[PDB]
Symmetry: C2
Subunit: 87 residues, 2 copies
């Protein structure tokens, strides 16, 4: 499984994808360095999460990305079209 965020960017830059992860990390109180297997592919950011004490899951992180969607958009200048988990 991997997490993803689909944006309106064609294509999404690597820098912007990492900024999304920085904001998300701050909200889930973890190091942005706990996001692994990162790539941007077309308009999408994909990632996994490293083992952690907190037991934070991909589910948890994508739910969180919905909770703070407005903040993610405001701080990055992009639009988030989908957030989910792929197989």
């Amino acid at each position: 499984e991997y997490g993803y965020i689909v944006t309106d960017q064609k294509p999404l830059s690597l820098a912007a994808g990492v900024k999304l992860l920085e904001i998300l990390a701050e909200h889930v109180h973890m190091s942005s360095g706990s996001f692994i297997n990162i790539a941007v592919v077309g308009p999408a950011l994909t990632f996994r999460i490293r083992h952690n004490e907190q037991n934070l899951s991909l589910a948890d992180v994508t739910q969180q990305a919905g909770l703070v969607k407005s903040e993610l958009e405001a701080q990055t200048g992009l639009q988030i079209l989908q957030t989910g988990v792929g197989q």
Copy 2:
């Protein structure tokens, strides 16, 4: 916002789509009639959720869909490739 389930069937049939919703409903102990605004679009099923006695959310229902993906697949023959929330 809407919830979605992306399959490996293009076009996804409406009947197959709502069969996914029935299995999902059984799993989360909600009536499938609480899934509203339903459409199939390409390989995807999209929906929203009405007031329900269980007070359940889109992130929660789509996370659960991810959890029971092998059941959804065993019962329908579809593969579930993504689950998430869109705008």
